[PDB]
Amino acid sequence: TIDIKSFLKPGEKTYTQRCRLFVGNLPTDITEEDFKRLFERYGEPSEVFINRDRGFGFIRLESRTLAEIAKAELDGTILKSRPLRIRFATHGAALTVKNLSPVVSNELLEQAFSQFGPVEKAVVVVDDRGRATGKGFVEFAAKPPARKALERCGDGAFLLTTTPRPVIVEPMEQFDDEDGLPEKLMQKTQQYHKEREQPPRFAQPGTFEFEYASRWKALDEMEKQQREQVDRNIREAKEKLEAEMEAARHEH
Amino acid sequence: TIDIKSFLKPGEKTYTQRCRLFVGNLPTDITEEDFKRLFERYGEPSEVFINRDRGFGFIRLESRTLAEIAKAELDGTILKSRPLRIRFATHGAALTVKNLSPVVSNELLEQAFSQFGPVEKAVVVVDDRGRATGKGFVEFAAKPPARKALERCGDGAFLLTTTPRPVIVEPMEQFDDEDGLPEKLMQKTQQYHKEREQPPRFAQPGTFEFEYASRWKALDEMEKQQREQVDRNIREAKEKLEAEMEAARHEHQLMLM
């Protein structure tokens, strides 16, 4: 048994879109007041929406952790004989930013993206040593500023620094690193059954499997070599352009 | 104010490396009992390590959520006039797995990797549609089983399915999507200052800035074209290998009498 208050993370803004909890399998008689009542224990709600005919509703909570608690506690709970379906409503307004200068901080990224509309969170992604990857993410309070940000940065050249290095803005690709692929959600097809016939094993040298797997390892090596060759060519091209343009900087 | 118990997520293993906290700036007089005492409120710890001379230690809590709570509550707390530094311990035994068949589940990936040693968690990564990406991760309880898995899968061909599609095992690249790049950790060099001179803005068509930024957009387009050319080379090579291996399957089978 334990008590806490304010499960907010340092630097986490309140009532973010990450705290948007979709609610499914609600009774048809559901009122907006009864819907709010269900989540009473998770503090003051926000962005309450209910589709009475469809039996689903959008709610939002103070922090990501309260939304995870509400989901953990309430998912499967029985309301008017039906088990509730509780999940998160996927961040439409999320963006992945690339081609960031190493001097761009979380603060500068937020400052820049705020030109498009209100920013919930902006993060410059760092590696294990704590050095900038050149990638970051920007989450807006609403979808119209994120679309504005996406469209304007795609057509025009958005610069964060003095050097005209344009920022690459793409929608954030949503991936689940928690639930993944459970056996219960996986269909037991005749292909599943044929592929799982042979257990996990090391391919034995000399065998047909080993020969095929050696060829696949060699193909993976060629892919790695070619991809590294592309990374190298991109660097040679950037070094030969910035050596021409800094000279051409004296044309007009 | 709110009450809960067992902040464990569905299918989350207890006391994993994801529950491990690094604790720094501890008093030199710190005893192992006093260290445990500090975290009393977060339930029973499994794993307690303290380096008294260096003023740091490790503690492992039951769930990821309890470790987040302990960190949120205790980071910066004053002990014998010094503020405590509490951070998640970087996972020392996490691996990224690639070239997974679409029929590989979290359970099969765990089952497979457990051959190398105890697995804390194994996840088959899925997209927004809930379809397999072909990528996954495996976190071991300790570094020796992770190294064994890395070495053995690199030299040999580890297969998870009937079809001899080998699994690609690499150390998991550690990236922080929470703290990122704070201004306080960023050095205020001449270059930082020179780069921050001009504010964020749209490059105006016709200008020198726009011409340079258009050339950078064209370089990003060359990267896309080259990477698509690699994808094409790989499809052609895979088609070639498959034909050759159907012929080699017949050869292998016909050798046996």
Curated annotation (Swiss-Prot), chain A:
Residues 19-91, 93-174 form the RRM domain. GO terms for biological process: activation of innate immune response; innate immune response; membraneless organelle assembly; negative regulation of DNA-templated transcription; regulation of circadian rhythm; regulation of DNA-templated transcription; rhythmic process. GO terms for molecular function: RNA binding. Residues 62-252 are annotated as: Sufficient for paraspeckles localization. Changing residue 56 to A: Abolishes accumulation in paraspeckles, but not in perinucleolar caps. Keywords: Acetylation, Activator, Biological rhythms, Coiled coil, Cytoplasm, Immunity, Innate immunity, Methylation, Nucleus, Phosphoprotein, Repeat, Repressor, RNA-binding, Transcription, Transcription regulation. Expressed in pancreas, kidney, skeletal muscle, liver, lung, placenta, brain and heart. It comes from the Eukaryota. The keyword Transcription regulation applies. Disulfide bonds: none annotated. It is found in: Nucleus speckle; Nucleus, Nucleolus; Nucleus matrix; Cytoplasm. Residues 168-252 are annotated as: Sufficient for perinucleolar caps localization and interaction with NONO. Belongs to the PSPC family. RNA-binding protein required for the formation of nuclear paraspeckles. Binds to poly(A), poly(G) and poly(U) RNA homopolymers. Regulates, cooperatively with NONO and SFPQ, androgen receptor-mediated gene transcription activity in Sertoli cell line. Regulates the circadian clock by repressing the transcriptional activator activity of the CLOCK-BMAL1 heterodimer. This is Paraspeckle component 1. It comes from Homo sapiens (Human). The chain holds residues 64 to 315 of 523 of the full protein.
Swiss-Prot record, chain B:
One of its GO terms (cellular component) is fibrillar center. The keyword Repressor applies. Keywords: Acetylation, Activator, Biological rhythms, Coiled coil, Cytoplasm, Immunity, Innate immunity, Methylation, Nucleus, Phosphoprotein, Repeat, Repressor, RNA-binding, Transcription, Transcription regulation. One of its GO terms (biological process) is regulation of circadian rhythm. Expressed in pancreas, kidney, skeletal muscle, liver, lung, placenta, brain and heart. Residues 62-257 are annotated as: Sufficient for paraspeckles localization. GO terms for molecular function: RNA binding. Changing residue 216 to A: Abolishes interaction with NONO and localization in nuclear paraspeckles. Changing residue 135 to A: Abolishes accumulation in paraspeckles, but not in perinucleolar caps. It comes from the Eukaryota. Residues 168-257 are annotated as: Sufficient for perinucleolar caps localization and interaction with NONO. It is found in: Nucleus speckle; Nucleus, Nucleolus; Nucleus matrix; Cytoplasm. Residues 19-91, 93-174 form the RRM domain. The keyword Transcription applies. Belongs to the PSPC family. RNA-binding protein required for the formation of nuclear paraspeckles. Binds to poly(A), poly(G) and poly(U) RNA homopolymers. Regulates, cooperatively with NONO and SFPQ, androgen receptor-mediated gene transcription activity in Sertoli cell line. Regulates the circadian clock by repressing the transcriptional activator activity of the CLOCK-BMAL1 heterodimer. Forms heterodimers with NONO; this involves formation of a coiled coil domain by helices from both proteins. Found in a RNP complex with CAT2 transcribed nuclear RNA (CTN-RNA). Interaction with NONO is required for its targeting to paraspeckles and perinucleolar caps. Interacts with SFPQ. Part of the HDP-RNP complex composed of at least HEXIM1, PRKDC, XRCC5, XRCC6, paraspeckle proteins (SFPQ, NONO, PSPC1, RBM14, and MATR3) and NEAT1 RNA. Interacts with ALKBH5 (when acetylated); interaction with acetylated ALKBH5 facilitates recognition of N(6)-methyladenosine (m6A) RNAs. This is Paraspeckle component 1. It comes from Homo sapiens (Human). The lineage of its organism: Eukaryota, Metazoa, Chordata, Craniata, Vertebrata. The gene is PSPC1. The chain holds residues 64 to 320 of 523 of the full protein.
